[PDB]
Design a protein around this ligand. Sequence first.
Ligand SMILES: CC(C)(C)S(=O)(=O)C[C@H](C1CC1)N1C(=O)[C@@](C)(Cc2ncc(CC(=O)O)s2)C[C@H](c2cccc(Cl)c2)[C@H]1c1ccc(Cl)c(F)c1
Length: 105
Amino acid sequence: MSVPTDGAVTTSQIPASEQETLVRPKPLLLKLLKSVGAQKDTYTMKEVLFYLGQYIMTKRLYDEKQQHIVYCSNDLLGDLFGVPSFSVKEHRKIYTMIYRNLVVV
Ligand SMILES: CC(C)(C)S(=O)(=O)C[C@H](C1CC1)N1C(=O)[C@@](C)(Cc2ncc(CC(=O)O)s2)C[C@H](c2cccc(Cl)c2)[C@H]1c1ccc(Cl)c(F)c1
């Protein structure tokens, strides 16, 4: 991954321009972002990914770093994505799950 700013994370798995897409999170996604310090209603996708990563780590949903699975069936995140678990390595899949929870500007 790459970190172009102190509040953004990017990946070579997704086109660079796509990660600059402006989005307005729906209520659940927005709540998760603000719980780790986000202070706005519109974000670029790379910012959303940063804050959601912060949420995941703060909630201890990725304690086992060598296995690349996030376990979230009992967390708000599981309800948001509609899955009990997912791989942190499958970036298109993650983007897809996030897109379902926002409006693209
Ligand atoms: C290190 C930090 C800057 C704090 S991080 O990158 O934000 C940590 C984070 C951990 C919480 C899951 N994470 C990951 O750990 C990454 C490194 C997971 C991997 N992707 C690919 C890997 C090896 C490979 O190329 O096969 S390892 C990179 C992974 C990532 C980065 C950028 C975009 C996407 Cl879609 C995913 C990132 C992450 C971000 C957000 C969500 Cl919702 C995730 F499920 C995963």
